[PDB]
Design a protein around this ligand. Structure first.
Ligand SMILES: Cc1c(Cl)cc(Cl)c2nc(CCc3nc4ccccc4[nH]c3=O)nn12
Ligand SMILES: [Mg+2]
Ligand SMILES: [Zn+2]
Length: 313
């Protein structure tokens, strides 16, 4: 237990910043995650052997899809790491433990298709989980991996601490259904403005963690422009494949998923920043001031999409 994970100097310094990109070396991603657990939680939070075995089963249960893959999982965990490290004293020991795991697991066994496409295809998961279909599946895959021999990283917790941490993870993962984000953020906006927001109220904390999960999930829009732009290419590679699968079912896909409407992407990105990303990081910054760099980076990326529309890119 005297085994610190360390990182080369550039990674050691840059991992602390919100805009860090975990890089193209897949074999370094498990080490990067353990490094983040050790610093945001402690070398004592998890047994190394169990944690390592859990990480590698999680990786194996992400598919080789263009965007909703193992790289996305670690990227979303790093954004959470950055939020937790900039808000040291606001989070409980169980929240520290639960949230990095929730982020690593939040898209487990994603197939590259929306809840909407599973409902239209009539996939078995759509009959098992009528709303937040993929997100209920991701939580289900998380419990399955935690129950494999030698994979229970929470085995040192009491029965009630264990139930609390799995409840934090379930809610965090469900919150990554962007259909739920709009109402969650509106409620948080009203509570912050009327001054009713109270972090001792468990159902208020739940809403704030939900928004943190949206913020981490969307964190592609908070990177250096070349990261943002190249990640958008992966996002559309998925959306357009789903669009193709919609046309195979005899359904005109929405424009966001129709590869024949590529020309509309820059304006689609503008809508997305204005309707989803900017309001997400605005409310997050109001509640947790030290997350302001996420909002500032998002606004810089919106200005870059504006440049793309004006033909200056
Ligand atoms: C960057 C990013 C993240 Cl991080 C996560 C998610 Cl879910 C996401 N979805 C989009 C697509 C936005 C979008 N493109 C469109 C393209 C063409 C026509 C209409 C569109 N209408 C849209 O709304 N970008 N995106
Ligand atoms: Mg998801
Ligand atoms: Zn995700």
């Amino acid at each position: 237990g005297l085994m610190q994970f360390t990182l080369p100097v550039r990674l050691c310094k840059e991992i602390e910043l919100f805009h860090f990109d975990i890089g193209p070396f897949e074999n370094m991603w498990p080490g990067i995650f353990v490094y983040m657990v050790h610093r945001s939680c402690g070398t004592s939070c998890f047994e190394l052997e169990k944690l390592c075995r859990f990480i590698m089963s999680v990786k194996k249960n992400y598919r080789r899809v263009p965007y909703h893959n193992w790289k996305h999982a670690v990227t979303v965990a790093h954004c959470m790491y950055a939020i937790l490290q900039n808000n040291h004293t606001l989070f409980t020991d169980l929240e520290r433990k639960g949230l990095l795991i929730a982020c690593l697991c939040h898209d487990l066994d994603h197939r590259g298709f929306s809840n909407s496409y599973l409902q239209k295809f009539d996939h078995p998961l759509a009959a098992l989980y009528s709303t937040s279909t993929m997100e209920q599946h991701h939580f289900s895959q998380t419990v399955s991996i935690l129950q494999l021999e030698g994979h229970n990283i929470f085995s040192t917790l009491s029965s009630s601490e264990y139930e609390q941490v799995l409840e934090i993870i379930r809610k965090a993962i469900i919150a990554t259904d962007l259909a739920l984000y709009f109402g969650n953020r509106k409620q948080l906006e009203e509570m912050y403005q009327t001054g009713s927001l109270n972090l001792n109220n468990q159902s208020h904390r739940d809403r704030v963690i939900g928004l943190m999960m949206t913020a981490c999930d969307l964190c592609s829009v908070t990177k250096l422009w070349p990261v943002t732009k190249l990640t958008a290419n992966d996002i559309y590679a998925e959306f357009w494949a789903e669009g193709d699968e919609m046309k195979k079912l005899g359904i005109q896909p929405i424009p966001m998923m129709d590869r024949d409407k590529k020309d509309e992407v820059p304006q689609g990105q503008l809508g997305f920043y204005n309707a989803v990303a900017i309001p997400c990081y605005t409310t997050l910054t109001q509640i947790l001031p030290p997350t302001e760099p996420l909002l500032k980076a998002c606004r810089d990326n919106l200005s870059q999409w504006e440049k793309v529309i004006r033909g200056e890119e």
